[PDB]
Amino acid sequence: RRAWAELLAGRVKREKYNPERAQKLKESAVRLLRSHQDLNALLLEVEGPVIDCDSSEAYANHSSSFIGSALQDQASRLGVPVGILSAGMVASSVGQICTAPPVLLTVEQRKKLSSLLEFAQYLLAHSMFSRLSFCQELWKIQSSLLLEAVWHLHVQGIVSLQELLESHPDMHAVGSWLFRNLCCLCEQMEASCQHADVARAMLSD
Amino acid sequence: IIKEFPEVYFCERPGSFYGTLFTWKQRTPFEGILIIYSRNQTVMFQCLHNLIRILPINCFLKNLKSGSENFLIDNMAFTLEKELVTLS
Amino acid sequence: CLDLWREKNDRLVRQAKVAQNSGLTLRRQQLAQDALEGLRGLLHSLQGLPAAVPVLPLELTVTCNFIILRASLAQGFTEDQAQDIQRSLERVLETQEQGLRELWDSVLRASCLLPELLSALHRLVGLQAALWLSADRLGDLALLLETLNGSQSGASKDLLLLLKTWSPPAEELDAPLTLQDAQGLKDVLLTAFAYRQGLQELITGNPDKALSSLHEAASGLCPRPVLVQVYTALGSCHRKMGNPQRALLYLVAALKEGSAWGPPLLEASRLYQQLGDTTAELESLELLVEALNVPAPQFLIEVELLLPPPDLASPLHCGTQSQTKHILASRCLQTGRAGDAAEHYLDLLALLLDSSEPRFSPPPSPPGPCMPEVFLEAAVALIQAGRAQDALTLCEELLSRTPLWVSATHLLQGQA
Amino acid sequence: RVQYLRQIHANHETLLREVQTLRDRLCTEDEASSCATAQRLLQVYRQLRHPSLILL
Structure with missing residues (x-):
């Protein structure tokens, strides 16, 4: 009976959850179902054997509204909201320019980045962009990111530093990621007084 | 229907509503939307009295002047975004 | 005379619809039963006359409304209503014996003699079909519809085709009232048959045949919960066919529109089995735990009757x-997460043993594992959790309460 | 004076992020476009208009 005394659980019995809890649960449910969704997977499941080229059909023009008019037939063939198509394609075409040849990047890594980041603000204006969907589809590309790119993001305001650093699942991952990239960038910025200016800007920011 | 403009349903009952034009669209298939180009303002009602009978029982019509809810909400949103952007 | 019964009909009908629209659990039922007995007495008074013609359409409407009331209040059918139908058919045919399928065809020929009642008749056939569909009489049901339409529809042996073919005959002109008409019937019939057909073809491993009928359900009359079920079903069909991303969207949509999302999380975990995303599996089901804790009718035919x-x-x-906390802890342990599966089994063991005051949990029965096996699984969870001293307490409690399980208890006790 | 400006800076900032979240939920069909969103915006309009445009 001391056996019972040790074994017995008290929290066991429960009640019928509150309605706000109901929508919280359903919210987190859909959140997780989308967290585990993936888009090249769907392009190859639904469509036969993602980048702005995959959307806009072979480099026709870098115009603004043309991309937008395509994304609609994209999300219509799929069933997704357009904002997530946009977030994923842009996370991908961000990993592209960070990767394809330190804590910094410069010329043409900047130019294509800004040719596309400008277009991001156009789609924000038309509301055809999801913003946490983009924070999370960047954290899928976690380590292929540049501290200068994310600061360009912070400053052109497609995303805030805080909308990133509260949207990462793991917090220790964030902390250490940032610690190492800081340590590397402060080993930088004494390399030359020109590198120093752009590094000091983002440091004090 | 008209084949070049198939977002239209001219009505062809050979009675009283004849001549009438309609449309239909459907976003989140609960929250639909309808538009009438009716002759005068009796065959703007007779429509509704014929219809709202037919519906589901909580089907909650309303009239519009200023724009659809989602559109107008986005439109307010955009102004507020810009405004606070400028004030920032 | 007819004036009086007609007024009576319309009176009770409006009374019924008022109880539908307004009223509380008390007064809805009170007015309902008052109307129901009014209808009973009226029906019997009408049976008090031998056969004559002008009563028939009204008579049929009346019995129809009666049945509708009766099954809407019962939330389930009975063959007393089949006897009511039998009786009416004989009442009719006496104008001009054997078995329902003979009755129906003779009666359809009798109506093909064109007495203006066929709206009523078609409503009634819808009713009888709803009976035969809750009863799974699909064979005779097909023959009945083939007789309803021309016999040229002899080879169209898919019932959905004949359902589409069943033309409700009239615009229902100035008439005795009703709670329902052949149109509102036909829609409910189409959705229910398509839903049953689709579920059977899914369960029998035909997730390609399934999707045709499952989308045919959502395309047409479909109350929000029916939608939730159809979407879970399409997601499961997509899992069987191997569309592990496509299924997620349909489940997400059932989450959005539904307030009843146990089965969705279930199918989601069934898909994280398929993908080995077992962290997503376990978390979806940890959510399902809370999901299941959570919780109207109408005086008419609905789409919940014919499920x-x-x-x-x-x-x-x-x-x-x-039952499902068991599956949580089980699959948790199988994943190799004993520290968590053990606590799951602890709370689950107290859910049954400490359940005296609140709603007592239902017994597992023959399909579920017998109560002692869970003690062994709990002790093994504790042991792999290094919870040895308390595994002894569990063993002692077990042998206090009361085979292979005794020796197993000895073994786990030694292992502690 | 800087004192006033920093207050207004942060006080607008917070509302901005709130609206940004609400726009995200609009894009994703998350809460609803139904109603009371309307009122929740007009609340913001009314937090703005009161000392609107002090011209000094």
């Missing part, structure tokens, strides 16, 4: 909180 209950083989069946 079979959730069978285990169907993806929409859900174990109780305890």
